[PDB]
């Protein structure tokens, strides 16, 4: 699968091209190795990401994530993602998970990149699980083919990130809730996909839109299942005056010391990635909620938010 003499850029037609984002023939020496690499966009003008095709080794790649950003964490050929993904904010565009197949972008929908305000780089994370296939000492070029176009898209994809920052999980503690909430104050977004992220202590993650005190399910997932972007059961609009609300349920069981929010496996995260589309003339590409503005509101959270997925 390694790119040879033809390189990473395929002409599709007048205004479209495929960009292949692949590891430069890497060979992991340990299990659960996270490798990152970057690619500058080959065009300066604004472009739209309208499709993704995975190029994974079905024998060694556990997951892949693709981000857009302006400042990749390294200037090197490739690095361990422990160093970081991007030094500015990494905008997730795509997740590929083993045993949980991705869902296509709706037609007419694209991420805006490049230009004056869009991402100038793609960063690709590859999670290598079982490295028993690397007994060959073979070079791996797993990654993702992205379909770019110059043609403006009627609908712009973006990300609403809900994330905990203050969470403290005391050791042995049966149940710890991490609650996130913000008022929505932009033009309408329609949620079409969601991804959940915790580390090993996470039991369930749920996101809701609350309007006039009524809770509407965006997504609810066990974070110990493959962390792909999952389609929303039914399209959900989030509109001015709505509150977005999310809860991660953790346990402290099995830990001798307290667990707080951080980047390592002995730390936790409570992340819910809400992938939306917006009308192009109304669109903004990213929003983040790191707060809990209506904590008392969580008294009426559906009971399913506290119950593990069977």
Active-site annotation, residues: 62-63, 125, 127, 197, 199, 269
234 marked ligand binding residue = no
Q: Which residue is nearest to Cu ion (CB)?
A: 63
Return d(Cα 207, Cα 8) in angstroms, integer: 37
147 marked ligand binding residue = no
Nearest to 185 by CA among 238, 137, 139, 136: 238
- Closest CB to Ni ion among residues 67, 276: 276
Output the DSSP codes for 235-275: EEEE-TT-EEEEEEEE--TT-SS-EEB-SSTTSB--EEEEE
Return d(Cα 26, Cα 57) in angstroms, integer: 12
- Closest CB to Cu ion among residues 235, 263: 263
Contacts with 50 (C-beta within 8 Å, 6 or more apart), sequence order: 105, 109, 110, 147, 148, 149, 153
Q: Tell the smallest beta-carbon distance from residue 235 to Ni ion (Å).
A: 6
Strands 155-163 and 109-113: parallel
Return d(Cα 135, Cα 60) in angstroms, integer: 11
Is 195 a binding residue for Cu ion by CB under 5 A? The answer is no
Return d(Cα 132, Cα 75) in angstroms, integer: 30
- Closest CB to Ni ion among residues 24, 106: 106
The binding track of 215-254 with respect to Ni ion, each residue x by CB under 5 A or -, is ----------------------x-----------------
Q: Tell the smallest beta-carbon distance from residue 127 to Cu ion (Å).
A: 4
Is 55 a binding residue for Cu ion by CB under 5 A? The answer is no
- Closest CB to Ni ion among residues 166, 237: 237
199 marked ligand binding residue = yes
Is 59 a binding residue for Ni ion by CB under 5 A? The answer is no
138 marked ligand binding residue = no
Number of residues that bind Ni ion (CB under 5 A): 1
Output the DSSP codes for 6-32: T-SEEE-SSSEEEEEEE-SSB---SSS
> Contact positions toward Ni ion, by CB under 5 A?
237
Q: Which residues are annotated as a binding site for Cu(2+)?
A: 62-63, 127, 197, 199, 269
> Contact positions toward Cu ion, by CB under 5 A?
62-63, 127, 269
């Amino acid at each position: 699968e390694c790119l040879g003499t033809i390189g990473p850029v395929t002409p599709l037609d007048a205004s479209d091209f495929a960009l292949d984002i692949r590891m430069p023939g890497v060979t992991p020496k340990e299990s659960d190795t996270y490798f990152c690499m970057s690619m500058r966009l080959p065009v300066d003008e604004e472009a739209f990401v309208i499709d993704f095709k995975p190029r994974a080794s079905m024998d060694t790649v556990h997951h892949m994530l693709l981000f857009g950003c302006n400042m990749p964490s390294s200037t090197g050929s490739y690095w361990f993602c422990d160093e970081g993904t991007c030094t500015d904010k990494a905008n997730i565009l795509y997740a590929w998970a083993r045993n949980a197949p991705p869902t296509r972008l709706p037609k007419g929908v694209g991420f805006r990149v490049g230009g004056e305000t869009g991402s100038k780089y793609f960063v690709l994370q590859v999670h290598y699980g079982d490295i028993s296939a690397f007994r060959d000492n073979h070079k791996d070029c797993s990654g993702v083919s992205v379909h770019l176009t110059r043609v403006p898209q009627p609908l712009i994809a973006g990300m609403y990130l809900m994330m905990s920052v203050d969470t403290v999980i005391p050791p042995g503690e049966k149940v710890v809730n991490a609650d996130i909430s913000c008022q929505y104050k932009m033009y309408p977004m329609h949620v079409f996909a969601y991804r959940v992220h915790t580390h090993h202590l996470g039991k369930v993650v749920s996101g809701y839109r609350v309007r006039n005190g009524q809770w509407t399910l965006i997504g609810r997932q066990n974070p110990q299942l493959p962390q792909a972007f999952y389609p929303v059961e039914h399209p959900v609009d989030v509109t001015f005056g709505d509150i977005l609300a999310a809860r991660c349920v953790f346990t402290g069981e099995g830990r001798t010391e307290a667990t707080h929010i951080g980047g390592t496996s002995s730390d936790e995260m409570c992340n819910l990635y809400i992938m939306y589309y917006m009308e192009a003339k109304y669109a903004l590409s990213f929003m983040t909620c790191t707060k809990n503005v209506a904590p008392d509101m969580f008294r009426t959270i559906p009971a399913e938010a506290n119950i593990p997925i069977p």
